[PDB]
Every structure is written in C-alpha cells, then in structure tokens.
A paper describes a structure:
We show that [name] not only exhibits a high-affinity interaction with bovine complement factor I, but it also serves as a co-factor for factor I to promote cleavage of complement C3b and C4b. This protein-protein interaction thus plays a crucial role in modulating the complement activation on the bacterial cell surface and increasing bacterial resistance to complement-mediated killing.
To identify structural features of [name] that would aid in its function, we sought a high-resolution crystal structure of the protein. By removing the flexible N-terminal region and lowering the surface entropy on the C-terminus, we were able obtain protein crystals with high diffraction quality. The eight β-strands on the C-terminus fold into a barrel, coined the barrel domain, and the six β-strands on the N-terminus form an open-hand-like structure, referred to as the handle domain. These two domains are held stably together through a network of hydrogen bonds. We also observed two short helices present in the loop regions of the protein. Noticeably, the overall architecture of [name] resembles that of previously known Slam-dependent SLPs.
Numbering used by the authors: 103 to 318
Amino acid sequence: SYNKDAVFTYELIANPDADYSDQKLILKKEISYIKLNLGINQDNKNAPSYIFNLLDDNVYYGFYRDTQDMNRIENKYTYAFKKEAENFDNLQKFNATYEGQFWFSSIDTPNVPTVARAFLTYNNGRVDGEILAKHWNEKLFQITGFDNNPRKVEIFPTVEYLPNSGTRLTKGATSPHRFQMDLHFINSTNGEKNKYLVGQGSTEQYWGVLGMAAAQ
C-alpha cells in the first residue's frame, strides 16, 4: 500500500462566506492524491497545502494540512516507504553516519512548519546525534539510543523554546517533553543498503518527522 504516485493529502477550501458570518473558516475537506517527484514537492511556495521530500523512489517524508474542527489548521507529519525496501539486518555493531532534516510544529503554532538539521551516528551500536537549527549551529535536541535497539531513538530538547514557539519545554534527558521514535532503515533503488532513515514522533507540545540519508 506504498505509492509515491498517489500520496494522500487534503485540499482545505476556505469558506468565502465566513468573511461575513459565523460559519466555519473551511468550507470543505477534499482528498487529493499527489504524484511525487524526486526531492521537494509542494503546490505553492508561500502557502503550501503540503510539502513532501521524496529522498528516493522507495521513501518520502513530509506533511499535509488537516483540521478537526474546520477552523483550526495543523500540520500532519508523516512518511512512507516501500515495504520490500526496508532493511531488517542486525545493526547491533552498525557503523554509519546520517545527515538530514527534522520537520516539526509546536502546539501554539500548529500550522507553522519548522525545519531543523539532523545528524545521527551509529558507532559499534552506540547511537548518538543532534538536531540543529537550520541556519546556525544551535543545538535544539539531543538524540540518543533507546532500549539498545538501533531502530529506536529518544530525542530530548536542549533549549527551552523551539523556533517559532513560546511553549516552554524542560531540557535534558529526563525531560517529560522528550519522546521516543521508531526508525526504519530503507535501501535505495540504486543499491545502497541502509541509505535512508525515517521515523516520526510527538509530545503534547510539539510533533514532527525525521528523514535522513547516509554519508557515502
């Protein structure tokens, strides 16, 4: 049921008559399947309904916009991968480094997409990494292995306020605002094993998706 040729999204149609009455801001929610090209896919550069990053024919990540009450809009982060392309090798002594991006929104700005840079190192099973601000080397999150499983990480904040947010987080490894993430190693269509790494997670205060590529 993976199909980068028909990716689910919502078209959210503004209700014009809400300009002059107490009707919902959104008139209708309509399903709309997108066919992805390699790289960044979006319909509008300044008010996109969705952004998806097809890293490879076998895996994408991104978000589409949703609303539960037809008034408030929030980004829904997701990822998908060809099932057969997932790598199930034993990665307990894995040696590799990944570089990519973390896309997220915060509870007080649920429709505002924040992009950060992400780095993850596998050294003989030890899993450690970091999430940095897009344009400068400020550390936003620490990444660490969870439960001695190379496919599970724990991500915890190292700042009290994320970009574009005024929601105060607690910092550090015992922070109740940390979260755990299941990761999936995806092989490339050009025969690179474990080339791509995707997962997603959430807390009450922020939620997002992680997508990464191996350093060759």
